[PDB]
Structure formats: structure tokens, C-alpha cells
Design a protein around this ligand. Structure first.
Ligand SMILES: NC(=O)C1=CN([C@@H]2O[C@H](COP(=O)(O)OP(=O)(O)OC[C@H]3O[C@@H](n4cnc5c(N)ncnc54)[C@H](OP(=O)(O)O)[C@@H]3O)[C@@H](O)[C@H]2O)C=CC1
Ligand SMILES: CN(Cc1cnc2nc(N)nc(N)c2n1)c1ccc(C(=O)N[C@@H](CCC(=O)O)C(=O)O)cc1
Length: 161
């Protein structure tokens, strides 16, 4: 299948601060919503706890090592292979991150969905560095600024061959 990364990031690749986004952009969540809709979302359990609930219309798969972790409305995988085992006949798969989880699927990544925020937030979890060269870009577009989304941000999509 197609393994896709889906990340929002800072001009310095920052993706989170607390166990939370260092920003609050409701419109960003909607490009994200519409892109992933109808597709499994694989998210690290630390990511999940930052969302606190199952996101409708998609298979929510939560990656933990913890044999006893359960949340109603989500599957759980203790493994990259268990994730693939669950996504047996899937077409595309969205790695919804946590950097620990971006790290686990780096060998499998087929494409990239990156929002770039042009601003410096002082966060502490970063999106890992990626293949110099390789990935050819396929899509650029500018998002939506307003009171509530008061940062300049752009959607990007890359693909490797
Ligand atoms: N801006 C953005 O696009 C996004 C931002 N974020 C932010 O990033 C932060 C979360 O990222 P991060 O802290 O790296 O954590 P993660 O979201 O990657 O979740 C980490 C958890 O995944 C589980 N895990 C890690 N490795 C394995 C393994 N080999 N097998 C099974 N389970 C494993 C562990 O769970 P356990 O300890 O239970 O065993 C680990 O604690 C938060 O601040 C969040 O808001 C996250 C996603 C996107
Ligand atoms: C902490 N966080 C993770 C998050 C935020 N922005 C991202 N942005 C991108 N580009 N990629 C990600 N992986 C990403 N992940 C969240 C928090 C809330 C919602 C959320 O409730 N989103 C709704 C849409 C808005 C809503 O229902 O309130 C959804 O179902 O997608 C999603 C992501």
C-alpha cells in the first residue's frame, strides 16, 4: 500500500511543545480532516492523548507497547508489523505522527503531507529530518489567515518514486 506521513510543522521543524500543538489553528484541522477522511490513522499513544477522542470516519489505530491499553472506538497495535497486519488490504495509510511514530515508519514512507507554519514557536518535539534529494514535490498551496488562524501557513505534498 501507500504509506503517507501527515504532519504540521514550524519554520524550524517544531511539531509540539507540551504534549500538545504549540498553536491553535482550527482551519488547519480541516484540510487534515478532508485529506484523511475514509482512511486509517496511525498515531502514537502520546499523540492520541493529545487528541483525547476517536476522530470520526477513519480507523484510529494507536501505537503503544502497553499490553493493557484500550480505548473504545480505537484499535491498538503494539508493533509496526501489527499495524501492517491490521491494515491488511488497505490502499493508503496515514501516519498521523508523534515523532517516535514518524521514526518507526520512515523505511516504509511513500509520500508526505506537510503544512509549514512561517513562525517560530519554542516547542520541543520535532519532525525528523528526511531524504536529501529523492522526494519530488507535487503540490503547493497557501492556507487561510484570520483571527483564529493568525499565522501564515502553506500546504505541501511530496512523493518519492
Ligand atoms: N504538529 C503535528 O502535525 C503533530 C504534533 N504532534 C505532537 O508531538 C507530540 C507527540 O509526539 P511524541 O512525543 O514523539 O510521541 P508519539 O505521538 O510518537 O507517541 C509515542 C508513543 O508511541 C509508542 N511507541 C513508540 N515506539 C513504539 C514501538 N516501537 N512499539 C510500540 N509502541 C511504540 C509509545 O507508547 P507507550 O509509551 O504507551 O508504550 C510512545 O510513548 C505531542 O506534543 C503532539 O501534540 C504529534 C503529531 C502531529
Ligand atoms: C493534536 N492534534 C494532532 C494534529 C494536529 N494537526 C495536524 N496537522 C497536520 N498537518 N498533520 C497532523 N498529523 C496533525 N496532527 C489534533 C487535535 C485535534 C484534532 C481534531 O479534533 N481534528 C478534527 C477536526 C476539527 C474538530 O473536530 O474539532 C478531525 O477529526 O480531524 C486533530 C488533531
Amino acid at each position: 500500500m501507500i504509506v503517507s506521513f501527515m504532519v504540521a510543522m514550524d519554520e524550524n521543524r517544531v511539531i509540539g511543545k507540551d504534549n500538545n500543538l504549540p498553536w491553535r489553528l482550527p482551519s488547519e484541522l480541516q484540510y487534515v480532516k478532508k485529506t484523511t477522511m475514509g482512511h486509517p490513522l496511525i498515531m502514537g499513544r502520546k499523540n492520541y492523548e493529545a487528541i483525547g477522542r476517536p476522530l470520526p470516519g477513519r480507523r484510529n489505530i494507536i501505537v503503544t507497547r502497553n499490553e493493557g491499553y484500550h480505548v473504545e472506538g480505537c484499535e491498538v497495535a503494539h508493533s509496526v508489523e501489527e499495524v501492517f497486519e491490521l491494515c491488511k488490504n488497505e490502499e493508503e495509510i496515514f501516519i498521523f505522527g508523534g515523532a517516535q511514530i514518524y521514526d518507526l515508519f520512515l523505511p516504509y514512507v511513500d509520500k508526505l503531507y506537510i503544512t509549514k507554519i512561517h513562525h517560530a514557536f519554542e516547542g520541543d518535539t520535532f519532525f525528523p529530518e528526511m531524504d536529501m534529494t529523492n522526494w519530488k514535490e507535487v503540490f503547493v498551496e497557501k492556507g487561510l489567515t484570520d483571527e483564529k488562524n493568525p499565522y501564515t501557513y502553506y500546504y505541501h505534498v511530496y512523493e518519492k518514486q
